[PDB]
């Protein structure tokens, strides 16, 4: 009736509450590992950035994006999509390498023409050098990485363990090395294959850091989202409780009408 | 039953079906008697009528009479006053969950709602008592773990937890044992299994001793010999 | 289940498929069906007789009627006098079926009548002994032993639940008396099962021991798959990536539900229900995409009608599936992987 | 200094002398060094912080002296002693792999890594 | 082969005495796949 | 389907199914955002939101009250109008476009109006 | 507390500890307990009797018995009757403890009487002056003034909650009248924590006013720790702050 | 309440939520209707006020589902509605 329709919907809400609780807790567990990775990685990355800065960082482009395969990230997938979308007005023909299914869906809508490479098995794992390296090896061959004047990577920088700002950076190519001239304030021999090697090595080193930052932000957002869900569900629980109680009183009052029938006897 | 209890001076084992019909019947003649029916239309003297029936059924020094009274719970709500009044009056409640029946477990008993006032180390002995506590926990863990299994998946779960779930599933289908009255159904005669044998076999499962035995090789079978045999049957 | 919402239609379907047995000779296969209509308007009845004449089943139908206008005593008296008419067949050793649509309005008639008769008490304003009235009525339908009789009156009571309020006194009373409950759910009706039977709450206590032997074999784990589908589906709509095995269940389950669905006023031959359940249970349809399940059903049956019509004849004629017949049937399905 | 870093751990990212195996031969850095980039090859490495010397087996990477005497070192994974028998097992695999042949690079690297570890 | 693939393969080789941590083993063992795309249309997904 | 035709019945069936799902996902919609709804569903839900808005028709007696000139839509027109919308042909236009309008042609025209 | 969830057991435990004082020669501190078995079958009360005999408690215990079989007028007057026995003790200046188990069944009996006497039903179909009835019973218990002699009649009513329905009319009235409530929780009972007390939903309104000074000192902390433990039960599937882990450990132990 | 509503032509439901949350007049326009008074007005107050009832029941709807991707049309309505 009323009573049952309240109760079944309330049960749905309850079950959801339990699931979001469960998810949030498991998310916290995952979050520590995700965050841990980004510190070590970020420390490693900065040392290379020290070179690139001092060298000067001076520049069809590539877009790489990072999400997990897994969903319930939060709005990571579509906020990242939005920060891509602005620069997909600035490059509507950009070739997108999608590291993760979730960003793939949003971008796939925006231009399926752009979708050229995608990588599975991302979301399941926590970012690893093996993956980054293999992706790097494939990037050169598949995407013809060298063609772009500079690559660009989009990821989610985990600003705080309650926040995420989607962030991007440009991966510096051999072209960058070529026309940066304060590379000469780090001079090495022509015999050294250091431009073509350093390009590849920091192609991956930058990418891994971006992935770690993204993964931590993703898991962080998921925790935040699942916490807020639990809260929203509580409010609805309370609203249906008040309705339930009033309905219970009204059924008792109708029973009191039956008592009044007994009074007629 | 009184003639048996008293005059034949013997123990009995009474069976009545269904006592919700007993409740319903009295309510109707309350109304026909014009006596203002109490809550949810149930007769005013419901408690006291039930009480006379229960009081009559007891162990005296003349005999012992063991009633099994079926009770039908309309729309499976036990806080309905007619079931609730009966809920007090009985000593060894059993709930048969529709869900568990549907899972194909016959017995369809809900093992988390099976309650008997007697179940202690003083009653069934310390080993039995302890084992049954472990079973309850194992099953309760399995039920709790259904939520983790639900989203993350069975595969995505802790190793300690996974062995507990797997063992609980083995216990779950251990319960399923054939009935003589499910020769009509399954075609498999009932299986009478001694208390000691059940305690021993269930202990083994919990320890993981019978983790070389398939989950389904506990399904709808009785005895340990059969459980082992059905592992072989499935194996071959 | 909820009033009028195919409430009439479920019953008419039973009458219609029983045309096949009825046309055939042997009086035990003949159901001299009695449709009892209480509280319904003359126009509704007129549509009913028109439908029955359209499907030309009036050739064995009896319509006992108590229209909305007709007196509250006459309405009260209507089930009990319908029962006697049925008993004449039953007594004769003949099989028959009595649809009591809807007993809920009979109870109201006895409510109004009893209150006008100054009958003092009443749960929901229905005086006690309505259960006595209804119970005696329902217990007057039976399968009679060869020694004493040979007829079987079958009864189908119909109770229209007021907003699904099953705790209502009249629905509660009936549930105890009856040997099955066939809950129908409105949401599932809209969801596209038309009629929609909520099998989760529907039961048939006697169950299989009156199900066709072949159909008993095939639908053995159909129940298990569906039951699992219900549980799995409930968690599954929280849109998490479940185990692939779990999504196998989900996929298999989705297809099964769609398979069950059938349109109103269309009966179906048992010989052509055995294949569909075999196919489904043997998971061939689990693969076949949800949208084109309807296409598969129609076409598969047409395909068997064309080619494996020998096979269909055997299932019909012998009503059991040999190892060979099960294999033949499997092969036929595989051959029609076209969809 | 030395700012030895791995993605999974950071080993030094002061460290007075670092001895590095490079495509530029062998490079030693002590305090300030002239401002260079050197690619680190798969390597046997010595790192000294004070006179104390630590002996490392390294999967190659990159080395880049910053002109502020900050030796930015990036490599994938390292101790030499921890690595130092399974490498012999690996040699069997590497020989087998060479029999068939990226596989060429794999087998070549496995032999190279073994030789380089074997060197110490 | 590419320098970072070359170095990667070396790191993987280097974890084989085997006396190496879980993070190392995870860092040098991935079963991840990669779905190539073109146009929309996907050249088949295959192990990375 | 033998009265108002199979095509009508099929069209109506899809409307009913879509709306019942949409009603079902009302819980989910509130607890978890639109984005967090599955992609297949997110299209369905968005379609259903449009359909919901589509059902309004300004009346010719309440033309005064709504302030929108009343639109009466032929039955022959109706089946066509929903059919297209169900195939999402015109779906790509505001929910406002579907709000308080008559025939399919009017929706299209009001998209042009909104676009201005 | 929850229905038949060893309600009688929790109560019976108190009586056994009263054996310690009873054995003692301090006659004011000889609490002569009264158990009021309402609608409890003669077999159940026989078990009670045997258990009491086993624990040698029958020699200060009084059991006023109105069993399930025993008629509803007797049941109606049964708690009132019991109180009179207590008054004699109280009047003699002694102390005693009367445990009314359970007033929920008293309500039903009064209902049976009231309806048969054509007195109207009231909230939750219990007669309207059930409030007045309960209030009359529950105010008889009391610790008298010094001039009127230092005596008392301690009381501990036992109330059966259908499913924990504290909303229910008979619980709400009673909850207000008594100074304190203890609310046992079924999950805890099942989880083997017997007593199954839900600490949050157990309060005493006079409480620590009567408490041993020593025991007061070493159990203020206990209240605060447990309070934190309830909140800090909220993890399962992590690694927690050292403070949180300490709390969790303290709470679990 | 329903008995009165059905007799009366028009209702002017007021919401506590709006009252508490400032907004006096606190007159919910979801549940305020006038079904006879809309033709009792001077033409000036018919002309100026045209379809504003729809607009603020578009604002009501808009902020219902506002609680990410909001098109300029919806944003415009929201901006106008709030103001």
UniProtKB/Swiss-Prot annotation, chain A:
Changing residue 259 to T: In ATP3-1; dominant suppressor of the slow-growth phenotype of yme1 strains lacking mitochondrial DNA. Keywords: ATP synthesis, CF(1), Hydrogen ion transport, Ion transport, Membrane, Mitochondrion, Mitochondrion inner membrane, Transit peptide, Transport. It is a peripheral membrane protein. It is found in: Mitochondrion; Mitochondrion inner membrane. One of its GO terms (biological process) is proton motive force-driven ATP synthesis. The keyword Nucleotide-binding does not apply. InterPro entries: ATP_synth_F1_ATPase_gsu (IPR035968), ATP_synth_F1_gsu (IPR000131), ATP_synth_F1_gsu_CS (IPR023632). Belongs to the ATPase gamma chain family. F-type ATPases have 2 components, CF(1) - the catalytic core - and CF(0) - the membrane proton channel. CF(1) has five subunits: alpha(3), beta(3), gamma(1), delta(1), epsilon(1). CF(0) has three main subunits: a, b and c. Present with 28100 molecules/cell in log phase SD medium. PubMed:12898710 reports two tandemly repeated copies of ATP3 (ATP3a and ATP3b) on the right arm of chromosome II in several laboratory strains, including S288c. This has not been confirmed by the yeast genome sequencing project. This is ATP synthase subunit gamma, mitochondrial.
From Swiss-Prot, chain E:
Its main location: mitochondrion. Transmembrane segments: none annotated. GO terms for molecular function: proton-transporting ATP synthase activity, rotational mechanism. GO terms for biological process: proton motive force-driven ATP synthesis; proton motive force-driven mitochondrial ATP synthesis. InterPro entries: ATP_synth_F1_esu_mt (IPR006721), ATP_synth_F1_esu_sf_mt (IPR036742). Keywords: ATP synthesis, CF(1), Hydrogen ion transport, Ion transport, Membrane, Mitochondrion, Mitochondrion inner membrane, Phosphoprotein, Transport. One of its GO terms (cellular component) is mitochondrial inner membrane. It is found in: Mitochondrion; Mitochondrion inner membrane. Belongs to the eukaryotic ATPase epsilon family. PANTHER family: ATP SYNTHASE EPSILON CHAIN, MITOCHONDRIAL (PTHR12448), ATP SYNTHASE SUBUNIT EPSILON, MITOCHONDRIAL (PTHR12448:SF0). Mitochondrial membrane ATP synthase (F(1)F(0) ATP synthase or Complex V) produces ATP from ADP in the presence of a proton gradient across the membrane which is generated by electron transport complexes of the respiratory chain. F-type ATPases consist of two structural domains, F(1) - containing the extramembraneous catalytic core, and F(0) - containing the membrane proton channel, linked together by a central stalk and a peripheral stalk. During catalysis, ATP synthesis in the catalytic domain of F(1) is coupled via a rotary mechanism of the central stalk subunits to proton translocation.
Curated annotation (Swiss-Prot), chain F:
GO terms for molecular function: ATP binding; ATP hydrolysis activity; proton-transporting ATP synthase activity, rotational mechanism; proton-transporting ATPase activity, rotational mechanism. The keyword Electron transport does not apply. Its main location: mitochondrion. The keyword Glycoprotein does not apply. One of its GO terms (cellular component) is proton-transporting ATP synthase complex. It is found in: Mitochondrion; Mitochondrion inner membrane. Keywords: ATP synthesis, ATP-binding, CF(1), Hydrogen ion transport, Ion transport, Membrane, Mitochondrion, Mitochondrion inner membrane, Nucleotide-binding, Phosphoprotein, Transit peptide, Translocase, Transport. GO terms for biological process: proton motive force-driven ATP synthesis; proton motive force-driven mitochondrial ATP synthesis. Present with 164000 molecules/cell in log phase SD medium. Mitochondrial membrane ATP synthase (F(1)F(0) ATP synthase or Complex V) produces ATP from ADP in the presence of a proton gradient across the membrane which is generated by electron transport complexes of the respiratory chain. F-type ATPases consist of two structural domains, F(1) - containing the extramembraneous catalytic core, and F(0) - containing the membrane proton channel, linked together by a central stalk and a peripheral stalk. During catalysis, ATP synthesis in the catalytic domain of F(1) is coupled via a rotary mechanism of the central stalk subunits to proton translocation. The chain holds residues 393 to 508 of 511 of the full protein.
Swiss-Prot record, chain H:
The record marks 32 as: Required for activity. Disulfide bonds: none annotated. Signal peptide: none annotated. It is found in: Mitochondrion inner membrane. It comes from the Eukaryota. Mitochondrial membrane ATP synthase (F(1)F(0) ATP synthase or Complex V) produces ATP from ADP in the presence of a proton gradient across the membrane which is generated by electron transport complexes of the respiratory chain. F-type ATPases consist of two structural domains, F(1) - containing the extramembraneous catalytic core, and F(0) - containing the membrane proton channel, linked together by a central stalk and a peripheral stalk. During catalysis, ATP synthesis in the catalytic domain of F(1) is coupled via a rotary mechanism of the central stalk subunits to proton translocation. F-type ATPases have 2 components, CF(1) - the catalytic core - and CF(0) - the membrane proton channel. CF(1) has five subunits: alpha(3), beta(3), gamma(1), delta(1), epsilon(1). CF(0) has three main subunits: a, b and c. Present with 41500 molecules/cell in log phase SD medium. Belongs to the ATPase alpha/beta chains family. This is ATP synthase subunit alpha, mitochondrial. The chain holds residues 376 to 460 of 545 of the full protein.
């Amino acid at each position: 009736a009323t009573l049952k329709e309240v109760e079944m919907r309330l049960k749905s809400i309850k079950n959801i509450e339990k699931i979001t609780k469960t998810m949030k807790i498991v998310a916290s567990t995952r979050l520590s590992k995700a965050e841990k990775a980004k510190i070590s990685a970020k420390k490693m990355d900065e040392a290379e950035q020290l070179f690139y800065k001092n060298a000067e960082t001076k520049n069809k482009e590539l877009i790489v994006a990072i999400t997990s395969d897994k969903g319930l990230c939060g709005s990571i997938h579509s906020q990242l999509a939005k920060a891509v979308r602005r620069h997909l007005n600035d490059q509507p023909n950009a070739d997108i390498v999608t590291i993760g299914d979730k960003i793939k869906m949003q971008l796939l809508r925006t231009h399926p023409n752009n979708i050229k490479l995608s990588i599975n098995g991302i979301g399941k794992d926590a970012p690893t050098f093996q993956e980054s390296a293999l992706i790097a090896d494939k990037l050169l061959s598949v995407m013809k990485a060298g063609t772009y004047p500079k690559i660009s990577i989009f990821y989610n920088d985990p600003v705080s363990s309650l926040s995420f700002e989607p962030s991007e950076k440009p991966i510096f190519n051999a072209k960058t090395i070529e026309q940066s001239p304060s590379f000469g304030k780090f001079e090495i021999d022509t015999d050294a294959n250091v431009p073509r090697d350093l390009f590849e090595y920091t192609l991956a080193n930058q990418m891994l850091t971006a992935m770690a930052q993204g993964y931590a932000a993703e898991i962080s957002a998921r925790r935040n989202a699942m916490d807020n869900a639990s809260k929203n569900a509580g409010d609805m629980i309370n609203r249906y409780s008040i309705l339930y109680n009033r309905t219970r009183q009204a059924v008792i009052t109708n029973e009191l009408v039956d008592i009044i029938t007994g009074a007629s006897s | 039953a009184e003639y048996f209890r008293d005059e034949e001076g013997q123990d009995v084992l009474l069976f009545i079906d269904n006592i919700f019909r007993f409740t319903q019947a009295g309510s109707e003649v309350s109304a026909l008697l014009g006596r203002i029916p109490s809550a949810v239309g149930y007769q005013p003297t419901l408690a006291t009528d039930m009480g006379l029936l229960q009081e009559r059924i007891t162990t005296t020094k003349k005999g012992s009479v063991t009633s099994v009274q079926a009770v039908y719970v309309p729309a499976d709500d036990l806080t309905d006053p007619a079931p609730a009044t009966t809920f007090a009056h009985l000593d060894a409640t059993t709930v048969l969950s529709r869900g568990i029946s549907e899972l194909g477990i016959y017995p369809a008993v809900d093992p988390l709602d099976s309650k008997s006032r007697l179940l202690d180390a003083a009653v069934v002995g310390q080993e039995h008592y302890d084992v049954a506590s472990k079973v309850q926990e194992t099953l309760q863990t399995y039920k709790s773990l259904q939520d983790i299994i639900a989203i993350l998946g069975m595969d995505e779960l802790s190793e300690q937890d996974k062995l507990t779930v797997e063992r609980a599933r083995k216990i779950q289908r251990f319960l399923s044992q054939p009935f003589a009255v499910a020769e009509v159904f399954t075609g498999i005669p009932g299986k009478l299994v001694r208390l000691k044998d059940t305690v021993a076999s269930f202990k083994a499962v919990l320890e993981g001793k019978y983790d070389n035995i398939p989950e389904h090789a506990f399904y709808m079978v009785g005895g340990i010999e059969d459980v082992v045999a059905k592992a072989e049957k499935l194996a071959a | 289940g909820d009033r009028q919402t195919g409430k009439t239609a479920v019953a008419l379907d039973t009458i219609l498929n029983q045309k096949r047995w009825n046309n055939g000779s042997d009086e035990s296969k003949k159901l001299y069906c009695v449709y009892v209509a209480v509280g319904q308007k003359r126009s509704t009845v007129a549509q009913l007789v028109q439908t029955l004449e359209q499907h030309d089943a009036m050739k064995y139908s009896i319509i006992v009627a108590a229209t909305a206008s007709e007196a509250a005593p006459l309405q009260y008296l209507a089930p009990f006098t319908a029962a006697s008419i049925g008993e004449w067949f039953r007594d004769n050793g003949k099989h028959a079926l009595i649809v009591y649509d809807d007993l809920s309005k009979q109870a109201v008639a006895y409510r109004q009548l009893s209150l006008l008769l100054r009958r003092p008490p009443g749960r929901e304003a229905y005086p006690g002994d309505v259960f006595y009235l209804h119970s005696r009525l329902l217990e007057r339908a039976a399968k009679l032993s060869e020694k004493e009789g040979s007829g079987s009156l079958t009864a189908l009571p119909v109770i229209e639940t007021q907003g699904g309020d099953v705790s209502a006194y009249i629905p509660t009373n009936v549930i105890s008396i009856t040997d099955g409950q066939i809950f129908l759910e409105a949401e599932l009706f809209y969801k596209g099962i038309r009629p929609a039977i909520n099998v989760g709450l529907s039961v048939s206590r006697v169950g299989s021991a009156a199900q066709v032997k072949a159909l008993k074999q095939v639908a053995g784990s159909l129940k298990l798959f569906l039951a699992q589908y219900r549980e799995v589906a409930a968690f599954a709509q929280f849109g998490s990536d479940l185990d692939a095995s779990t999504k196998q269940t989900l996929v298999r389950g989705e297809r099964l539900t769609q398979l069950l669905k059938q349109n109103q006023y269309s009966p179906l031959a048992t010989e052509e229900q055995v294949p569909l359940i075999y196919a489904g249970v043997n998971g061939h349809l689990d693969g076949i995409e949800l949208s084109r399940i309807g296409e598969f059903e129609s076409s598969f049956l047409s395909y068997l009608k064309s080619n494996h019509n020998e096979l269909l004849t055997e299932i019909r004629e012998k009503g059991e599936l040999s190892k060979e017949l099960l294999a033949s049937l499997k092969s036929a399905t595989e051959s029609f992987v076209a969809t | 200094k030395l700012q030895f870093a791995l993605p999974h751990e950071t080993l030094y990212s002061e460290v007075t002398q670092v001895n590095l195996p490079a495509k530029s031969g062998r490079i030693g850095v002590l305090a300030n060094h002239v401002p260079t980039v050197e690619q680190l090859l798969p390597g046997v490495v010595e790192v000294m912080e004070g006179s104390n010397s630590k002996k490392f087996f390294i999967s190659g990477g990159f080395a880049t002296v910053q002109p502020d005497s900050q030796l930015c070192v990036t490599a994938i994974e390292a101790p030499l002693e921890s690595f130092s028998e399974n490498i012999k097992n690996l040699l069997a695999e590497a020989k087998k792999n060479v029999s068939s042949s990226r596989e060429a690079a794999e087998a070549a690297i496995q032999v190279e890594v073994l030789e380089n570890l074997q060197s110490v | 082969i590419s320098y970072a693939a070359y170095l990667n393969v070396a790191a993987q080789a280097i974890r084989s005495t085997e006396l190496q941590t879980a993070s190392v083993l995870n860092r040098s063992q991935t079963d991840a796949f990669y779905t190539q795309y073109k146009n929309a249309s996907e050249p088949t997904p295959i192990t990375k």
